Design a binder for this molecule. Structure first.
Ligand SMILES: [Zn+2]
Ligand SMILES: [Zn+2]
Lengths: 148, 310, 310, 148, 310, 310
């Protein structure tokens, strides 16, 4: 699978790590579409052996939307796909806040069984990415706010 | 008209430099000259989702001093809007349509911020949202220091006891960090040492600080002694007994302490202050609580009234 | 002076046609123009023998809006006047001499009517006497329908959920039955079907009604959707899970619903309304509760004040 | 624009109903093969609409395992590809047991906060079915289970 | 040789006609000839998570009646302040290595089924798991109907009160359904009627049934009259008062009763049978629970013994 | 001839190398050859003042496994409204004349030590007295490490979670310290670290130890992996959330594990080990408590019998 590309407007990204393609089409809700969905999950694309991808036809994504990929897919990109050409393959980039896709580690946080949306702040240290909580205001390392 | 008009008092971090000195000035102006009917025809809900007869009597008192109606409750472990079946967001969506402002105390963190999202044009003052913030306690703390010492800068303040979980001492170190020249002596056990994140923001602003093991060392040079609250349930009862020495503060330790020095306490005390300290002029924890009605009177009159003539 | 002067608000059945449209008009007049000090120098007891922070904050708020003092309590499962040793009749014989009016919420049925017998010349407003009546809830229900739709006649209203034990929907069907042209669609499970006695008085007045199994059928033609409260403790947790479908109301069901249609709820919700319904303009259960302060403000000012200038 | 879409060894048919391919991804955990795979959502189908073309490579699906698909999707039949070569037809015929996927609608059931694998017997019911629980022993409809 | 040795015993549906007849015959044999050293050197746990007083002492008596030791607990409604102890899979696992069998009662349904694979080769008897029926009650019910009427086939067994939620009657109908010729009456109000899944089982096996209004309508021909709990916390107090009028079994409705008729009850009772049917030959519900000693003794000897000669 | 006949058994410090080896050898002998009539005609009390469910049934099973009778109680957190019952010296004295031995669990520390002289020649075993460690848990911990690894010397025993307050790990390190060659890892967060009195004991006996950050750092060489309770009501919810990330033992951190490694746990558990390490050959914490039957059976036979031939 080395020739393809250039199919329906929208855009497609590259360099999705392995096992990062899935669970990204869900946390950001992207399956909820009625058009050309052909993910490239579990398919090497370069230097590394394991990599995944995802493609979307007529569907642009705000700089802010793409930047919200960084944390998960730190080594990927975004090149506006229309049909043979490309308009700036902008890589993702750590946003100044991540909402709707992170649960707070503070069990006694008001935001868990409440009818509101999550929201964290961003800053790197040197070791991890401490995302701070919006409500409780306590700060955690991405590795902790990630899984559990 | 008024920078703090129709604003939410959720955290000390949100309050800028001139924000804290504006409510401090308004607490000193209303204390100098009562405002019997400033907030007249204004209803204020005292929704205390966590029982606290200290803070609820101080808040509701200040509502009544400006001549404002009051309608609230105390969950007291049951409350009708709980036990899974009613969200906090629904409770505030209803209470907002009833009253002009909402003072709420929640056991969970971030409860006051969540209330602002469903309040709309109804202000939301935080009386204590778990272990997160307590800006109303911090407003009366600085106001008590500004009266006695006369300033909020170049002061040798120290914080004793439980600094690790003490939410009152966390927000106080950030509020006094907004001023210059302040010297800090965090006198706690190793198990209750001040968090690194508080020592990080101090290092950023170039503020001096030092960790001791007792009050005996620094008592010569201190203008404030903010003794904090320590729970027996925070740790073992054995390691609470030992290592607690010199965090008990006897009145026989005020020999060489400065004349202008004043001992502050949030208010609930038992071990950390001895009863013989009351007779000395240093003790100022009951006068601090009395100044808490003016800090909460300044907060309400600045958020509901458009101007502040006096 | 005033037909409802010094009258007891025990039941919806006692209120005639012009009685309900008189407190409705007074709630629309006080909402249009506040009456800050109408009930000045009037004390009102908020004796809530059953805990309810929703209704007690709405009632006490409306007392304070007319500028009236308040002195009450919440039995909260203990109360001092109970545990066999003090009758309800003795409690009201004492509270009557203290205040000018008594708003009481009792867990037992007929408690408000019993209070009128020992009250004397002290009015008695019923905030909810068990599974019997709840006319204060019905006054804000009709007042919310009269604002949005503009009338109380020729409306296609429907009541979902627990209609068998729902005291709020019982008194609402009788209050809207006092008007003409109203169409009813009682959408409930078979275990919570509307009682035959309510279907008997409807048949007497020549009012049309029909039993469905879901909202999907009638959603095309409805101007109101009064979603009721359903307890998990009313039945099994298994037969509650199934058969509850289409009584949950998703926001994806408001596709073909009329533009002027408005969803009403008494206020305590959890299952019967989804959170995505809040964003739609149909949702009007928080604005219904906000209109509950005007229905209770109209009731008090009409019973204590001799005239109603405005 | 060329489309040599990848169809390697293993399993899968296309023609699976609308908004069902991603529903056959998270639940059965077909991504957890952790090897090599591909998808095809919103695709022209044979004898009906559109959508779904799920998984591939080293994933032999049993006869009773493709019966698990029947309840969700009644629009499939396994392909055991070798070289463009179609073989071994087996249709979703609806099984007598359904495990791991569904939830007991009963709140008082003790299978919700425990380390167990769910179990659900099944019997036909006028163009639909009734999934009984092995633990609760309460017979539920197969429609209110989809709502939770 | 052993059919029920080291078996599950969780629900009555798993037990066939050959399983029920082995437990009834073994209960009649150990009653006629007690073996106080059958289960010697064998421990049995009685893990009552839900506090049932009568059911735990009928089980622990049967354990001690064969000479086995006992280790049991009884929690008085736990779940204090939200989160409590261990999981139920984590409790049964550690209890299984201690003892040779478990006898567990859980408020949640499906708890006995959760314990079969986790216990290993250690059998677990179900003493009542929520609304998933009580199989030990069904075994002592069949033993009482067999020892007085002379058989379990061709009997006129009526069932009164709670049939929808009454678990003890559900599987009493399914157990008697495995026997042939059994006529069935279902005297219940229009609310607490027998479910459609029990009635459809009876239509499938060619078993005749019919819904009746009161006791006196079927009293002419009855061999058994099973009576159920019918608790006040189920249907609301007004509904419970109205229907409870003819459904209560007074001694005035026993004049058509046959000479061999016997009133049963799983227990307890309060407002279903008054205390004047005890001084009759038809009184046979107190010694039915005493017959449950032999039903739970036969059920414990089959599982904890390879072969038996009574 | 008898070493441990009529002995104290209160703390692990009193027991030497020759006391621990007699209880482990006797536990392996009664497991291999049960004696169901050893403690016949001998009563043992199980006076659980603090309600422990698993610990009382592992003790009362071992009593009934030797043929002894049992008389025990379990109070569900008493101290209702201040002053309650008797003193603990007054209770043990009257209970001592009844029975031949006591097995007491008390919330306060030093309760088992208070009962030795008051009981007279009646031995009293300690089943857990506050924060003064659990010696019966230490005996079944050593029995599990001996029966799988083949010995108690020259083993790589790690310890995870609560080490400062975790009593079950404190004396597990002191018991293994009496054995030689034992390497020690202490995987704990910077809070719940092992105390200085345990580490100074290890430096005195020439025993090697080292603090580690997580499970995977020591996983390459480990024969045992003791895991502790770590309750949420100890360190505050924000602190418990952050550290609990690498300290939890998932099945992903078992790839370096040796073929004879065995994970232990005193119990209960919730947020330290997930429920996917049960289906492995390294799963050995459920049957460790079942091995506590033989550890408490050997400990009861030595004290209540002059001499024994297993
Ligand atoms: Zn949070
Ligand atoms: Zn279930």
């Amino acid at each position: 699978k080395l020739q393809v590309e250039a199919i329906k407007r929208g855009t497609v990204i590259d360099h999705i790590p392995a096992q990062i393609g899935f669970k990204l089409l869900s946390l950001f809700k992207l399956t909820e579409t009625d058009q050309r969905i052909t993910i490239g999950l579990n398919l090497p694309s370069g230097e590394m052996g394991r990599k995944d991808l995802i493609k979307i036809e007529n569907t642009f994504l705000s700089e802010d939307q793409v930047d919200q990929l960084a944390l998960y897919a730190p080594q990927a990109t975004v090149n506006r796909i229309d049909n043979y050409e490309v308009v700036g393959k902008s890589r993702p980039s750590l946003p100044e806040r991540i909402d709707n896709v992170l649960v707070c580690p503070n069990s006694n946080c008001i935001s868990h069984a409440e009818p509101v949306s999550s929201s964290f702040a961003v800053r790197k240290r040197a070791n991890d990415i401490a995302l701070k909580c919006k409500y409780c205001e306590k700060e955690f390392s991405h590795n902790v706010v990630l899984a559990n | 008209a008024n920078p703090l008009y129709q604003k939410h008092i959720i955290s000390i971090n949100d309050l800028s430099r001139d924000d804290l000195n504006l409510v401090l000035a308004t607490a000193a102006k209303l204390k100098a000259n009562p405002q019997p009917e400033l907030l007249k025809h204004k209803v204020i809900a005292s929704c205390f989702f966590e029982a606290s007869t200290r803070t609820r009597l101080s808040f509701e008192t200040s509502m009544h001093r400006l001549g404002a109606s009051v309608v609230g409750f105390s969950d007291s472990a049951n409350t009708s809007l709980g036990k899974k079946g009613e969200t906090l967001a629904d409770t505030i969506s209803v209470i907002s349509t009833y009253v002009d402002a909402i003072v709420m105390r929640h056991p969970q963190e971030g409860a006051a911020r969540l209330a602002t999202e469903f309040s709309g044009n109804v202000p939301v003052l935080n009386a204590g949202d778990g272990s997160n913030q307590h800006p109303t306690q911090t407003l009366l703390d600085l106001f008590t220091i500004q009266e006695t010492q006369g300033r909020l800068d170049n002061l040798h303040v120290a914080m004793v006891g439980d600094l690790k979980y003490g939410r009152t001492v966390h927000s106080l170190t950030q509020a006094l960090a907004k001023f210059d020249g302040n010297r800090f002596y965090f006198i706690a056990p190793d198990a209750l040492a001040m968090p690194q994140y508080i020592l990080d923001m101090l290092d950023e602003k170039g503020i001096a600080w030092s960790l001791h093991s007792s009050i005996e060392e620094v008592m010569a040079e201190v203008d404030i002694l903010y003794m904090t609250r320590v729970q027996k349930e925070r740790l073992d009862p054995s390691e609470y007994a030992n290592v607690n020495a010199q965090f008990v503060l006897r009145a026989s330790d005020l020999h060489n302490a400065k004349a202008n020095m004043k001992v502050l306490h949030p208010l609930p005390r038992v071990d950390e202050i001895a009863t013989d300290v009351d007779k000395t002029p240093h003790a100022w924890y009951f006068q601090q609580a009395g100044n808490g009605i003016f800090a909460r009177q300044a907060l309400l009159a600045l958020v509901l009234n458009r101007d502040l003539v006096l």
